[PDB]
Enzyme design. Structure first.
Site, PDB file in Angstrom:
ATOM      1  N   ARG A   1      -0.238   4.351   2.836  1.00  0.00           N
ATOM      2  CA  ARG A   1       0.210   4.239   4.421  1.00  0.00           C
ATOM      3  C   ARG A   1       0.721   5.684   5.868  1.00  0.00           C
ATOM      4  NH1 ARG A   1       3.852  -0.390   4.783  1.00  0.00           N
ATOM      5  NH2 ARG A   1       3.813   0.108   2.930  1.00  0.00           N
TER       6      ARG A   1
ATOM      7  N   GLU B   1      -5.034   4.048 -10.922  1.00  0.00           N
ATOM      8  CA  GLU B   1      -6.149   2.281 -10.077  1.00  0.00           C
ATOM      9  C   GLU B   1      -6.847   2.070 -11.507  1.00  0.00           C
ATOM     10  OE1 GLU B   1      -6.277   0.965  -6.090  1.00  0.00           O
ATOM     11  OE2 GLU B   1      -6.329   2.816  -5.647  1.00  0.00           O
TER      12      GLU B   1
ATOM     13  N   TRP C   1      -9.285   6.298  -0.393  1.00  0.00           N
ATOM     14  CA  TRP C   1      -9.633   7.250  -1.997  1.00  0.00           C
ATOM     15  C   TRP C   1      -8.878   6.142  -3.059  1.00  0.00           C
ATOM     16  CZ3 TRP C   1      -8.239   9.834   2.450  1.00  0.00           C
ATOM     17  CH2 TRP C   1      -6.978  10.578   2.607  1.00  0.00           C
TER      18      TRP C   1
ATOM     19  N   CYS D   1       0.801  -1.177  -0.098  1.00  0.00           N
ATOM     20  CA  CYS D   1      -0.059  -0.001   0.269  1.00  0.00           C
ATOM     21  C   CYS D   1       0.963   1.094   0.079  1.00  0.00           C
ATOM     22  CB  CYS D   1      -1.245   0.210   1.533  1.00  0.00           C
ATOM     23  SG  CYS D   1      -2.105   1.216   1.537  1.00  0.00           S
TER      24      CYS D   1
HETATM   25  C1  HEM Z   1      -6.381   6.285   1.811  1.00  0.00           C
HETATM   26  C2  HEM Z   1      -5.893   6.090   0.394  1.00  0.00           C
HETATM   27  C3  HEM Z   1      -5.796   4.948   0.277  1.00  0.00           C
HETATM   28  C4  HEM Z   1      -4.794   4.726  -1.245  1.00  0.00           C
HETATM   29  C5  HEM Z   1      -4.620   6.474  -2.381  1.00  0.00           C
HETATM   30  C6  HEM Z   1      -4.151   3.460  -1.805  1.00  0.00           C
HETATM   31  C7  HEM Z   1      -3.917   2.851  -2.363  1.00  0.00           C
HETATM   32  C8  HEM Z   1      -3.287   2.196  -2.258  1.00  0.00           C
HETATM   33  C9  HEM Z   1      -2.900   1.596  -3.946  1.00  0.00           C
HETATM   34  C10 HEM Z   1      -3.330   2.241  -5.010  1.00  0.00           C
HETATM   35  C11 HEM Z   1      -3.130  -0.064  -3.823  1.00  0.00           C
HETATM   36  C12 HEM Z   1      -2.482  -0.632  -4.754  1.00  0.00           C
HETATM   37  C13 HEM Z   1      -4.107  -1.569  -5.210  1.00  0.00           C
HETATM   38  C14 HEM Z   1      -3.560  -3.057  -6.743  1.00  0.00           C
HETATM   39  O1  HEM Z   1      -2.635  -2.090  -7.870  1.00  0.00           O
HETATM   40  O2  HEM Z   1      -4.702  -2.914  -7.105  1.00  0.00           O
HETATM   41  C15 HEM Z   1      -3.232  -0.302  -2.075  1.00  0.00           C
HETATM   42  C16 HEM Z   1      -3.418  -1.467  -1.920  1.00  0.00           C
HETATM   43  C17 HEM Z   1      -3.673  -2.261  -0.564  1.00  0.00           C
HETATM   44  N1  HEM Z   1      -3.845  -1.291   0.332  1.00  0.00           N
HETATM   45 FE1  HEM Z   1      -4.484   1.132  -0.025  1.00  0.00          FE
HETATM   46  N2  HEM Z   1      -4.399   3.221   0.286  1.00  0.00           N
HETATM   47  C18 HEM Z   1      -5.030   3.419   0.754  1.00  0.00           C
HETATM   48  C19 HEM Z   1      -5.964   3.074   2.060  1.00  0.00           C
HETATM   49  C20 HEM Z   1      -6.092   1.640   2.362  1.00  0.00           C
HETATM   50  C21 HEM Z   1      -7.109   1.458   3.431  1.00  0.00           C
HETATM   51  C22 HEM Z   1      -7.588   2.023   4.723  1.00  0.00           C
HETATM   52  C23 HEM Z   1      -6.258   0.395   4.421  1.00  0.00           C
HETATM   53  C24 HEM Z   1      -6.963  -0.367   5.066  1.00  0.00           C
HETATM   54  C25 HEM Z   1      -7.354  -0.100   6.105  1.00  0.00           C
HETATM   55  C26 HEM Z   1      -5.185  -0.142   2.671  1.00  0.00           C
HETATM   56  C27 HEM Z   1      -4.980  -1.168   2.229  1.00  0.00           C
HETATM   57  C28 HEM Z   1      -4.051  -1.797   1.642  1.00  0.00           C
HETATM   58  C29 HEM Z   1      -3.697  -3.783   0.933  1.00  0.00           C
HETATM   59  C30 HEM Z   1      -4.368  -4.157   1.959  1.00  0.00           C
HETATM   60  C31 HEM Z   1      -3.514  -2.976  -0.232  1.00  0.00           C
HETATM   61  C32 HEM Z   1      -2.634  -4.201  -0.962  1.00  0.00           C
HETATM   62  C33 HEM Z   1      -4.570  -5.692  -1.268  1.00  0.00           C
HETATM   63  C34 HEM Z   1      -3.795  -6.996  -1.934  1.00  0.00           C
HETATM   64  O3  HEM Z   1      -3.115  -7.381  -1.486  1.00  0.00           O
HETATM   65  O4  HEM Z   1      -4.161  -7.047  -2.920  1.00  0.00           O
HETATM   66  N3  HEM Z   1      -5.154   1.198   1.621  1.00  0.00           N
HETATM   67  N4  HEM Z   1      -3.552   0.689  -1.537  1.00  0.00           N
HETATM   68  C1  LIG Z   2      -5.087  -5.547  -8.690  1.00  0.00           C
HETATM   69  N1  LIG Z   2      -5.580  -6.566  -7.995  1.00  0.00           N
HETATM   70  C2  LIG Z   2      -6.501  -7.209  -8.136  1.00  0.00           C
HETATM   71  C3  LIG Z   2      -6.471  -7.851  -6.796  1.00  0.00           C
HETATM   72  C4  LIG Z   2      -6.685  -7.777  -5.417  1.00  0.00           C
HETATM   73  C5  LIG Z   2      -6.939  -8.678  -4.594  1.00  0.00           C
HETATM   74  C6  LIG Z   2      -8.257  -8.420  -3.297  1.00  0.00           C
HETATM   75  C7  LIG Z   2      -7.865  -7.076  -2.837  1.00  0.00           C
HETATM   76  C8  LIG Z   2      -7.303  -6.176  -3.662  1.00  0.00           C
HETATM   77  O1  LIG Z   2      -7.793  -5.044  -3.147  1.00  0.00           O
HETATM   78  C9  LIG Z   2      -6.660  -3.721  -4.186  1.00  0.00           C
HETATM   79  C10 LIG Z   2      -6.736  -2.674  -2.807  1.00  0.00           C
HETATM   80  C11 LIG Z   2      -6.425  -2.907  -1.926  1.00  0.00           C
HETATM   81  C12 LIG Z   2      -6.947  -1.434  -0.828  1.00  0.00           C
HETATM   82  C13 LIG Z   2      -6.953  -0.149  -1.562  1.00  0.00           C
HETATM   83  C14 LIG Z   2      -7.545   0.641  -0.720  1.00  0.00           C
HETATM   84  C15 LIG Z   2      -7.312   1.721  -1.457  1.00  0.00           C
HETATM   85  C16 LIG Z   2      -6.948   2.247  -2.485  1.00  0.00           C
HETATM   86  N2  LIG Z   2      -7.659   3.001  -3.063  1.00  0.00           N
HETATM   87  N3  LIG Z   2      -6.533   0.909  -3.502  1.00  0.00           N
HETATM   88  C17 LIG Z   2      -6.453  -0.422  -2.962  1.00  0.00           C
HETATM   89  C18 LIG Z   2      -6.322  -1.271  -4.003  1.00  0.00           C
HETATM   90  C19 LIG Z   2      -6.901  -6.743  -5.129  1.00  0.00           C
END
Ligand code: HEM
Ligand SMILES: CNCCc1cccc(OCc2ccc3ccc(N)nc3c2)c1
Ligand code: HEM
Ligand SMILES: CNCCc1cccc(OCc2ccc3ccc(N)nc3c2)c1
Ligand SMILES: [Cl-]
Ligand SMILES: [Cl-]
Lengths: 362, 362
Positions: free
Chosen positions: A68, A242, A237, A65
């Site tokens: 963070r 994305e 947000w 993420c």
């Molecule tokens: C506040 C705005 C936030 C932004 C801009 C942000 C941005 C992102 C982005 C761009 C990704 C990559 C997702 C992808 O490429 O599929 C991501 C992954 C992730 N974010 Fe954040 N995020 C935010 C808030 C949060 C919050 C609030 C949480 C949980 C409390 C969180 C937990 C995660 C997790 C767990 C992943 C990885 C999911 C996976 O392994 O598939 N994020 N975040």
């Molecule tokens: C593109 N990867 C998709 C596979 C996958 C499976 C389960 C969860 C997942 O989360 C991506 C993810 C998780 C949390 C987020 C929080 C904020 C944000 N802007 N994007 C976020 C994007 C993503």
């Protein structure tokens, strides 16, 4: 064994959590109580303070993420009290309204009762609370291909999509003791959507693209001190890439680059013209412009990486190891224009954290 | 010990090499001869066929290289016979001329005598045979910052740069038994350079950007069957992003994005305008256009990734494991528009291969 793992995770979480909350003196007695609870009951119950701080730590430890920096301002809603499907529905409706906040998005997590014996109390089928359906039959592709299997599962249960490219999937979840999930159509008044326009190119609206305001990820498990909250949807947000570089761009998603190239008036014939790259940039500019114009929170990848650098600095200053997944932290457009690209990150998994879990369909 | 490692590497290389060359029957006797040579002399000498095929295998096994489809057409020049600094100079001059080939670049490697007792016979100081000098003093930055330490080392030795942004560094290398390297100015007639213009935007020439035609990497070690060729410069043709997204774009290199934004007529004030991304695309389009217009070989990153997919397919069809470094294989612009981004790669190191080695300056 099961009972052993729990106690161990509990000791490690309580010690670290109370340390960060300046409550270190209270650790010994809290751990005593927990030990008894586990002996007597097989499990233990987090205080409101533990749950709230655990969910925040879990975000902080999410290697993939970029967002963070804001971990400590997570809005945590404790819904461990729900017992009925109407209550779950209403809690999910409420999460959407409060997170959306008229466009000024509040990062929020709603936490449902945890697994008991590894037995789920509530099982959410949606990948995100708000998402578009996808259909594929007779060579005809409609909507979001990533939603094809869930869409098919919903239609097995008596739901029917209108087969636009943007049908909203119903909320769908199953309660402990029910053989089948239930589904509820989303009230359209709760769902903000943003039409995609371009700041300079008026024809861009001919593409009739839109996306939803808030990504509310609803199929991950939150683990805190050995307690497994399999149902705990959360949102931030969007980062603009994305939507613009993946959801609308990927060949296996909405696959819009050729159409973008046409409306921006460039040929899509030669790799050396970098027409895909140029299309990506304009589509991504359109997405940021459109969210801003509507007053819906969004961050661009440069600002996001700048925030993440501050997160790195804050980790160092607080004496905490930083962990990260370089392959997910880099944005999918101009990654070398960010500091992230030019360093490396330790991809160790620290708990609390959010984890993948098996889908109940497919 | 030393003698042991060599024999082991030799057995493994000879077996694999002769297998690929359909010479498997000749292995037993070749290995016999090698064993004796090592006993008697401490080392062994590759046949022309072994050396040529080893250098090709080494390219094939280079995890970080997207250009590997063409591994088998590598032009290998055997210069194990050189003994003097005039011979080394002339071999390096020749490599530049033959690789350049009037613009139709031939991937080529020139191989010098290998380390003997770990004692280098020839030690090349240049990172690439053709590269620009860099200067940093009194707040004044001129040329390529990546060349600052080598430039300073050259000037210690009586070389003097004109202090343009594009001074060509001299060839600089040291012979066994000499305390100091020698340097030779590059004949300008050997060096193709390409002025950067844009296909649509005429003002782009105001930036007065140029780059050299052929990247000839000259500071890596080639290892083949336990023999260490520390001096073995090689080249391909450029992928356009190396120049447009890194050499000319990086803040720690030529840092040209703000100037690009100005000449293409966009503001460089707001992250949400994605002006850096837009500038990157136009600069990268300019680079490809300029090389093509001049008749100098270059590949764009889409075509390159398409070639790499064929390399993957060819590996599978030949029954060879594929290895790769995802973090280097993805291009630095629109990486998610390539198949590479969407899969993973095993980053195991297989020999023969090219390796980093310590710089003799700094
Ligand atoms: C506040 C705005 C936030 C932004 C801009 C942000 C941005 C992102 C982005 C761009 C990704 C990559 C997702 C992808 O490429 O599929 C991501 C992954 C992730 N974010 Fe954040 N995020 C935010 C808030 C949060 C919050 C609030 C949480 C949980 C409390 C969180 C937990 C995660 C997790 C767990 C992943 C990885 C999911 C996976 O392994 O598939 N994020 N975040
Ligand atoms: C593109 N990867 C998709 C596979 C996958 C499976 C389960 C969860 C997942 O989360 C991506 C993810 C998780 C949390 C987020 C929080 C904020 C944000 N802007 N994007 C976020 C994007 C993503
Ligand atoms: C034919 C055209 C070629 C193209 C287009 C190509 C492309 C590339 C690119 C883009 C990189 C990444 C460099 C960076 O980001 O710093 C790379 C790395 C590499 N290439 Fe190739 N390459 C080609 C030919 C060759 C040849 C002929 C060899 C050797 C025989 C070679 C060996 C390597 C090695 C060793 C690396 C990694 C160097 C390191 O670790 O720093 N390539 N290649
Ligand atoms: C940007 N990384 C610089 C560090 C470094 C150090 C030593 C060698 C090196 O090579 C990069 C490299 C190597 C071989 C290449 C062959 C062809 C090509 N177009 N680029 C190529 C680029 C790169
Ligand atoms: Cl999404
Ligand atoms: Cl280079």
């Amino acid at each position: 064994e099961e009972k052993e793992i729990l106690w161990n995770e509990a000791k490690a979480f309580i010690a670290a959590c109370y340390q960060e909350l300046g409550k270190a003196a209270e650790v010994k007695d809290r751990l005593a109580d927990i030990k008894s609870e586990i002996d007597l009951t097989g499990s233990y119950v987090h205080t409101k303070e533990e749950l709230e701080h655990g969910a925040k730590m879990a975000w902080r430890n999410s290697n993939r993420c970029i967002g963070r920096l804001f971990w400590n301002s997570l809005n945590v809603i404790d819904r461990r009290d729900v017992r009925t499907k109407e209550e779950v529905r209403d809690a999910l409706f409420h999460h959407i309204e409060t997170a959306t906040n008229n466009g000024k998005i509040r990062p929020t997590i709603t936490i449902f009762p945890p697994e008991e014996k590894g037995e789920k109390q509530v099982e959410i089928w949606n990948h995100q609370l708000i998402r578009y359906a996808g259909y594929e039959s007779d060579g005809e592709r409609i909507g979001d291909p990533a939603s094809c299997s869930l869409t098919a599962a919903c239609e097995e249960l008596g739901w029917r999509g209108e087969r636009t490219d943007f049908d909203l999937l119903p909320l769908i979840f199953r309660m402990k003791g029910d053989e089948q999930p239930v589904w509820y159509e989303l009230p359209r008044s709760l769902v903000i959507e943003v039409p995609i326009t371009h700041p300079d190119i008026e024809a861009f609206s001919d593409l009739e693209l839109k996306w939803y305001g808030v990504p509310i990820i609803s199929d991950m498990k939150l683990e805190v001190g050995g307690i497994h909250y399999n149902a705990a949807p959360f949102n931030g947000w969007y980062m603009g890439t994305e939507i613009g570089a993946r959801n609308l761009a990927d060949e296996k998603r909405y696959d819009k680059l050729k159409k973008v190239a046409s409306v921006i008036g460039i040929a899509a014939d030669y790799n050396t013209d970098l027409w895909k790259d140029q299309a990506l940039v304009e589509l991504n500019k359109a997405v940021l412009h459109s969210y801003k114009k509507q007053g819906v929170s969004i961050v661009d990848h440069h600002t996001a990486a700048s925030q993440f650098k501050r997160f790195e600095e804050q980790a160092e200053e607080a004496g905490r190891k930083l962990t990260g997944d370089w392959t997910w932290l880099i944005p999918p457009i101009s990654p070398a224009a960010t500091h992230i690209f030019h360093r490396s990150y330790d991809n160790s998994i620290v708990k609390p954290n959010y984890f993948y879990q098996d889908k109940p369909y497919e």
